[PDB]
Design a binder for this molecule. Structure first.
Ligand SMILES: O=C1NC(c2cccc([N+](=O)[O-])c2)=CCN1c1ccccc1O
Ligand SMILES: [Ca+2]
Lengths: 478, 88, 153, 233, 51
């Protein structure tokens, strides 16, 4: 390249042809030479004709040259039109990347990937730099993307959305090499988002908490915190800045540096609100509302109400259950109506993804078994339907009581252990598989050796399944 | 004896793995309870049904410069962080 | 220990109220409510397997028919003077409870104890020999005679 | 047009940080192009990052014979597209005759520099007297005329870099022959349009530069770490 | 030679899994495959990927 530049330069006719020298030094990777003796003397810069060389540097993976061009002047929004994007996504877009995009859209669909599928369908047939950044990032370019990422405004949103896209495209099973590179690039941009927000928080807290909440006029139609959630990027939320934001939004009006026992003590004794025991940092009726508004105490009031509801359910079910409903059954139906209204509200304000949560599944299940218990219970003067209604309410009480576990996950102490508890199910299922195999083998062998031609199915299953099952708690079959 | 004391060992191994990730998963799950309790503007639980009627009342009757300012604020620590990367 | 007792109390209350509601009808004595809701599912943690759910090993010589003497109430009867409770709903209920408490919930406490011992042992000798200061100062502070003579001083 | 490599980006960022820490004015041309553009951008960045604690002062001193769209008011104007920079919190535009007159603002600029260099304010550590530093990094006729007008006065404190056009020819040599030898080897592509009758004048300009070498100092290439601008000033 | 690091590398693992699923592409979920196993004349539908 240096030999060809010394031949091209000393013809004394094309010394004025800096465009030809620049295209020659772009076709080769000569960064230092083009910087040292084209842009040195500042004797002729136009700033408007650099678009052909810019498109050439984009399509040929020349990131240091686009860095040099932006350093010496070009506006990308001035550079980018819809014809440029259709030439990128139509001609300069690969076909194997598009096939991986199809496989990801078929098997692992997501809201952001539906958005990028819609925009790539737009451009294969207004936020310029973000779409160019998406183009660069799903090609696995890895160094043109950093150059454009330094030019963007919403840089945290850009890094989080890019991490989400590449983590989804790393799940496609064919062409595992591209999946590996997209995984590495995903990890790099999520590291970048975390390390930028820790600086933006370690200077100014109020402006970082201003950053966390914005939608960027439909970047991808969502938020910085929401994009960190939807990618299951749990290191962006386990950092002390977002944790401090969440705790300051959790205690609300009450300052965080007051002890918890003062707060629950003022919860139980209501007219104690007007005293100097709680700190409202973060005249009297404002103290009243600033206490009874915060998330902490509405949660705590709610769990006290729920424990009282369970005691009422237990009293009704064990000690007062007659052929006609007495007064505490009617109070019980009123409280279950309150719970039903809350859950149908939460279904309305969530939609279908409400049913994604397991607790809302068993929550709907418990409400359904309750109303089934009512419709068996009201048929009086029939002993079987009344006993059946009470049996349905007992199994329903099992469901309502086991929901208290998922209630108490918010605690600093019990919380991480209840979350740990669901990571054990594969060990439990391995145990139950091996135990069921040994149990069936021993039970059928013992029943076959001892007896002869049992014809009752109940006394088959009491002697093959049930008694070898009790031998797990140390019973020694008799 | 064998099959129960094997389950003990597997539980102990899984606890020994997942505990350094466990606090991260917990305080990630903390987001969902904070958002479902800070989303609704609500009264005490057994009174919420009253506010339900109030929402029925609704169905009875029926570029920004500081965002540019905070993005322009963000750009400065972006530049500072890039300087720190190339400083290390 | 407190995590174990919270989970065990939740399972214990759920099983005890479900079994007492399925079997009997309108117990009016508070003592025989709490002996049958709290105490017997508690004993099922040491491997007891709660008894009156089987309907073939249940004798009526341990009932009262009305709360007059010590014994529990009978399971509520049919018009044929037969027990009403389904075996196919109370045998697997006892099996699920007995699995959940006597095996999963105890062998989880073992794992958590082992993990806490695995953490705190390198800090444990430091905390012990920090606590050593307090006994050394309370025994070197007083100028004292033998303990049963200290009253003289 | 203006060549800004990232070393000069770091240097001028550090310069405006020093100006914010000390509460200092910065005098410059005040047009929209190149170095004044970058200075105005960093002024707006340090303003937008802190929003308080002695918001810095950037005076632009423009010629008014080169301003494109001109409006007479008493009432605020709206200057949109020499073009003026957006970010200078103060502008001053000198008055003269026709359009074709550069080097007009240099008289009032250097007269004001002399007046502050003689101005007394005893609440300082310079023994009063309000210290003044003059910086030059690029090149041109205006740079040499500004440096010699400063060093002809007392208390200029001229500081030059080690990269540029005239910054190199003042950094490197520290009579007529050596000046010619360095100027043709560091700026070859301007001398093709320069008559010798003013090249001897430029040799007289640089002789009056090097008349006082104590009032001049330089930034070098090995001196390129951090806090080099404080070490110069 | 019981060289189990030469087979625990992702290349031979990918070879083995591509030979294990066979005609069916690996990036389809398993429940569709076993569901089409139980219902035989469901083979002629767009639920499994034969890439
Ligand atoms: O919101 C809630 N809904 C119900 C609920 C409502 C209807 C039916 C059922 N159920 O069947 O398990 C449960 C459970 C308790 N609960 C609650 C109370 C205090 C704090 C946190 C909470 O989640
Ligand atoms: Ca719910």
């Amino acid at each position: 390249s240096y030999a060809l530049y010394k031949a091209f330069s000393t013809n004394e006719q094309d010394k004025d042809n800096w465009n030809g020298q620049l295209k020659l030094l772009l076709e080769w990777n000569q960064l230092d030479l083009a910087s040292d003796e084209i842009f040195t003397n500042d004797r002729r810069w136009e700033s408007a004709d650099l678009q052909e060389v810019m498109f050439t540097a984009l399509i040929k993976d020349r990131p240091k040259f686009v860095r040099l061009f932006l350093e010496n002047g070009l506006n990308l929004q001035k550079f980018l039109t819809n014809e440029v994007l259709t030439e990128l996504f139509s001609t300069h877009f690969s076909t194997l990347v598009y096939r991986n995009l199809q496989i990801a859209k078929n098997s692992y669909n997501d809201a952001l990937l539906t958005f990028v599928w819609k925009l790539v369908a737009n451009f294969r047939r207004r936020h310029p730099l973000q779409a160019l950044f998406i183009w660069a990032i799903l090609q696995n370019k890895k160094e043109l993307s950093k150059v454009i990422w330094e030019q963007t405004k919403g840089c945290t949103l850009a890094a989080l959305g890019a991490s989400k896209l590449l983590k989804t495209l790393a799940k496609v099973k064919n062409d595992i090499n591209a999946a590996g590179e997209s995984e590495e690039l995903a990890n790099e941009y999520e590291t970048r988002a975390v390390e930028l927000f820790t600086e933006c928080y370690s200077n100014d807290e109020d402006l970082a908490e201003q950053l966390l909440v914005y939608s960027c006029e439909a970047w991808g139609g969502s938020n910085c915190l929401e994009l960190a959630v939807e990618a299951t990027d749990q290191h962006f939320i386990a950092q002390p800045g977002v944790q401090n934001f969440l705790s300051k939004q959790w205690y609300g009006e009450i300052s965080r540096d007051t002890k918890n026992w003062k707060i629950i003590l003022c919860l139980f004794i209501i007219p104690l609100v007007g005293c100097g025991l709680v700190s409202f940092r973060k005249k009297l009726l404002w103290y009243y509302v600033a206490f009874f508004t915060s998330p902490f105490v509405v949660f705590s009031w709610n769990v006290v109400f729920y424990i009282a509801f369970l005691l009422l359910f237990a009293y009704v079910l064990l000690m007062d259950f007659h052929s006609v409903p007495h007064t505490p059954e009617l109070i019980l139906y009123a409280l279950v109506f309150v719970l039903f209204c809350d859950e149908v509200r939460q279904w309305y304000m969530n939609g279908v993804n409400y049913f994604t949560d397991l607790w809302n599944v068993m929550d709907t299940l418990g409400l359904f078994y309750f109303i089934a218990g009512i419709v068996f219970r009201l048929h009086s003067s029939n002993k079987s339907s009344l006993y059946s209604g009470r049996v349905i309410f007992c199994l329903d009480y099992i469901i309502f009581t086991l929901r208290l576990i998922h209630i108490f996950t918010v605690s600093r102490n019990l919380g991480p252990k209840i979350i740990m508890l669901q990571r054990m199910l594969i060990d439990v299922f391995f145990f139950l598989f091996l135990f069921a195999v040994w149990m069936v083998a021993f039970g059928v062998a013992r029943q076959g050796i001892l007896r002869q031609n049992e014809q009752r199915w109940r006394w088959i299953f009491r002697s093959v399944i049930y008694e070898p099952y009790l031998a797990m708690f140390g019973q020694v079959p008799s | 004896i064998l099959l129960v004391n094997l389950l003990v060992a597997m539980f102990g191994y899984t606890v020994g793995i997942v505990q350094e990730n466990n606090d991260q998963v917990w305080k990630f799950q903390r987001y969902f309870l904070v958002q479902e309790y800070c989303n609704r503007l609500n009264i005490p639980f057994p009174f919420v049904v009253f506010a339900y009627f109030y929402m029925v009342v609704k169905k009875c009757f029926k570029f920004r410069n500081e965002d540019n300012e905070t993005l322009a604020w963000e750009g400065v620590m972006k530049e500072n962080y890039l300087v720190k990367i190339n400083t290390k | 220990v407190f995590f174990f007792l919270f989970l065990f109390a939740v399972w214990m209350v759920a099983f005890g109220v479900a079994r007492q509601g399925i079997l009997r009808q309108n117990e009016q004595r508070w003592r025989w409510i709490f002996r049958s809701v709290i105490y017997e599912p508690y004993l099922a943690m040491f491997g007891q397997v709660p008894s009156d759910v089987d309907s073939t090993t249940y004798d009526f010589s341990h009932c009262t028919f009305s709360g007059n003497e010590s014994k529990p109430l009978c399971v509520e009867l049919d018009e044929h003077n037969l027990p009403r409770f389904p075996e196919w709903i109370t045998i697997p209920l006892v099996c699920i409870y007995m699995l959940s408490t006597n095996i999963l919930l105890v062998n989880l406490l073992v794992a958590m104890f082992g993990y806490t011992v695995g953490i705190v042992q390198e800090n444990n000798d430091q905390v012990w020999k920090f606590q050593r200061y307090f006994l050394v100062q309370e025994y070197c502070n007083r100028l004292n005679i033998p303990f049963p003579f200290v009253v003289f001083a | 047009n203006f060549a800004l490599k990232p070393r000069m980006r770091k240097i001028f960022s550090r310069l405006i940080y020093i100006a914010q820490s000390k509460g200092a004015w910065i005098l410059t041309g005040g047009t929209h192009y190149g170095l004044m553009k970058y200075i105005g951008e960093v002024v707006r960045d340090n303003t937008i990052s802190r929003n308080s604690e002695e918001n810095i002062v950037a005076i632009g001193i423009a010629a008014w014979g080169m301003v494109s769209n001109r409006d007479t008011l008493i009432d605020e104007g709206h200057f949109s597209a020499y073009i003026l920079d957006n970010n200078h919190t103060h502008l001053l535009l000198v008055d003269n005759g026709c359009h074709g007159h550069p080097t007009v603002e240099a008289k009032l600029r250097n007269q004001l520099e002399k007046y502050i260099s003689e101005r007394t304010s005893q609440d300082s550590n310079y023994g009063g007297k309000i210290p003044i530093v003059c910086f030059a990094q690029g090149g041109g006729r205006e740079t040499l005329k500004a440096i010699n007008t400063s060093v002809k006065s007392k208390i200029p404190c001229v500081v030059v870099e080690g990269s540029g056009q005239i910054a190199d020819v003042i950094a490197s040599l520290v009579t007529s022959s050596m000046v010619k030898e360095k100027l043709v080897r560091f700026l070859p592509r301007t001398v093709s349009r320069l008559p010798e009758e003013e090249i001897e004048s430029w040799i007289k300009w640089l002789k009056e530069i090097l008349e006082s070498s104590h009032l001049l100092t330089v930034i070098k290439m090995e001196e390129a770490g951090d806090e080099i601008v404080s070490n110069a000033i």
